[PDB]
Symmetry: C3
């Protein structure tokens, strides 16, 4: 792998912590409800939820490093900005989930687009597309399995929120950037 172990671990933990904050926001606003109770929870989430997102974070960062021309100019400042953007957008979906689907989804698309405009490149966008498909698909399957459910005003995409698509896209863009940063910030001559 191109990531060092320690790097993948930090990325995993960063993904996990951000996921717990965002998922807690969804639960406490009634954006989503879990139905699973036999599993251990971490905060408001089943233990495997932060593992999945943390794994996805390190995985997408790794993936970027196998795509052409990882950018060596990427900075901690840019990375902090992208994480903030993704977290900000995530918690915003909790706050507006009960509003009509068009302005809500459009708002999140706007945030995702601006995030890419400021920070993303072609391969970054590609990583975003990959998770923008896989993320919602996994959630649809879990909802279909009765593991959790979305609020009725927030379930238009086969039982899950349409905002998940631009939300995951922005996530993929930033995770890619994070992988670029992991290399770029290594000690230099």
């Amino acid at each position: 792998m191109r990531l060092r172990i320690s790097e993948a671990v930090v990325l995993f933990l960063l993904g996990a912590v951000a996921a717990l904050i965002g998922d807690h926001s969804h639960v406490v606003t009634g954006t989503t409800v879990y139905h699973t109770d036999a599993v251990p929870f971490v905060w408001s989430s089943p233990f495997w939820f932060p593992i999945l997102v943390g794994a996805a974070t390190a995985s997408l960062a790794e993936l970027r490093l196998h795509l052409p021309a990882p950018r060596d100019g990427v900075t901690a400042r840019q990375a902090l900005g992208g994480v903030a953007a993704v977290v900000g957008t995530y918690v915003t979906t909790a706050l507006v989930h009960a509003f009509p689907v068009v302005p809500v989804t459009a708002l999140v698309c706007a945030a995702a687009a601006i995030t890419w405009c400021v920070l993303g490149d072609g391969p970054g966008a590609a990583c975003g597309v990959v998770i923008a498909v896989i993320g919602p698909a996994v959630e649809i399957a879990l909802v279909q399995l009765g593991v959790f459910a979305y609020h009725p005003d927030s379930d238009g995409l086969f039982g899950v929120a349409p905002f998940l698509a631009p939300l995951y896209f922005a996530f993929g863009v930033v995770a890619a950037l994070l992988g670029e940063l992991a290399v770029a910030r290594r000690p230099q001559l």
Copy 2:
């Protein structure tokens, strides 16, 4: 004209589509209600609404190209970012229209200002001023004519929402940028 026909057509369509999304958001949140019913509607809007905004988009882009020193460094990335900002702000007004007028209007002014800070120049700002006057004036006239109405908590500017002023301003700034892009993206040596 400085725009090519094909360019003006794309700008017109971009304006029209964004307008339909934003106007639908206003209707479905109860920000506005139409009273006209004898005209054909496109989605939630009278057919002439997207024509007006699309026309205004191409027109403002054209106008910029007659103002001093159109910037040749303008990119698709910048343009996508500005459109996202304008659409994001537009749908946000639908979401917050029922809140008190001061924080709502201030929020939209903030978005408009930041949009200009990131993307606009002097002539861009001038295009913004032009539509920030004309836009709301046209709406005031239409409301006065009983064509549509704003929500009572959102009609303080002679029957229309005070947020229309910074919203149109941001629109004018980005449309100007779009005209700069139309020239800048032409095939080069």
Copy 3:
């Protein structure tokens, strides 16, 4: 002092006006209620509130100029952008104050972080930390004294809103930038 008197006065007034807008937003949304009535009010605020914030604005700008390496490239465009960001974030706290504390506080942290990412440096961040401690501490004392109170869904930090911490932080970052601008914009050869 490094600031000229006229500069400190403009900064003071800018701070005062922005504070009045933000504080009015808090009062009118029920984010906060004043209990003091024997003092003259300016708009929705006791007269000393805008004095305190204006004083804090000029003071933090001054403070930055005693910290290492004030940036001479700082522009009016950057400064307008930062003020807009701080005001936008301020009024947003009024709009979302009744929502659950985690997504609300996280949203404001995100705005503060992005603001620093775009505009701040090390000493700027330090100014932010200084007021992110002092601001909320002063408010806690005033609330303890019964001078005003926060909404029950917005008082988790010893009686004041946890969002005050990232809000003041962003304020400190931008005020620092404003002090840099005051020097940088002086007439040049």
